[PDB]
């Protein structure tokens, strides 16, 4: 359920927030 | 706010979920 | 982490969304 | 949207988390 919630929430973000997410995700992978 | 919630939820994801977020965000950023 | 995220997200909601949350939570308790 | 995400996340909470959401929403609704 957490993945679905995150993906739904991503479209409240603009470019700067998406870059923050991408950097956190990359550091975790 | 929404960003802070997302970053906290990322700590709960497994590898496959992280890869799906990576692919989705990359598609949003590149277009 | 899920509780904190939910509580943070609640202030994006107005009265109608809060009532939806309260009804779902009550049915779960 | 945010509402749909919240309702999905509620399925992941334990009893104590549900009670904390109940108390927070009730305080927001009553004021
Ligand atoms: Cl998940
Ligand atoms: Cl999106
Ligand atoms: Cl939690
Ligand atoms: Cl609130």
Residue numbers in the entry:
A (entry chain B), C (entry chain B): 214 to 242
B (entry chain A), D (entry chain A): 214 to 244
Q: What text appears in the publication on this structure?
A:
Homo sapiens CFAP410 (HsCFAP410) consists of 255 amino acids. The CTD truncations that finally generated well-diffracting crystals were fragments covering residues 256–295, 212–246 and 213–246 of H. sapiens, T. brucei and C. reinhardtii CFAP410 proteins, respectively. All HsCFAP410-CTD fragments were soluble in a buffer containing 20 mM HEPES (pH 7.5), 100 mM NaCl, and 1 mM DTT. The crystallizing condition for HsCFAP410-CTD contained 1.5 M NaCl and 10% (v/v) ethanol (22°C). Those of HsCFAP410-CTD and CrCFAP410-CTD were determined subsequently by molecular replacement using the crystal structure of TbCFAP410-CTD as a search template. One of the mutations, L224P, is located in the C-terminal domain (CTD) of human CFAP410 and causes severe spondylometaphyseal dysplasia, axial (SMDAX). Our results showed that for HsCFAP410-CTD both the wild-type and mutant A219E adopted the same conformation. However, the disease-causing mutant L224P lost all characteristic helical features and became completely unfolded. Our conformational analyses of the simulation data showed that while the wild-type model of HsCFAP410-CTD agreed very well with the crystal structure (all-atom RMSD = 0.8 Å), the simulated model of L224P was drastically different from the wild-type crystal structure, with the associated all-atom RMSD of 4.4 Å. The single-residue mutation L224P in HsCFAP410 that causes the autosomal recessive ciliopathy SMDAX may be attributed to the disrupted oligomeric assembly that causes the mislocalization of the protein possibly by abolishing its interaction with a partner protein at the basal body.
Cilia and flagella-associated protein 410 (CFAP410) localizes at the basal body of cilia/flagella and plays essential roles in ciliogenesis, neuronal development and DNA damage repair. CFAP410 is a bimodular protein comprising two folded domains, i.e. NTD and CTD, which are connected through a variable unstructured loop. All these three crystal structures show a similar homotetrameric arrangement, with each monomer consisting of two α helices that form an open nutcracker-like conformation. Two CTDs first form an intercalated homodimer, and two such dimers further assemble into a tetramer by packing head-to-head through their first helices.
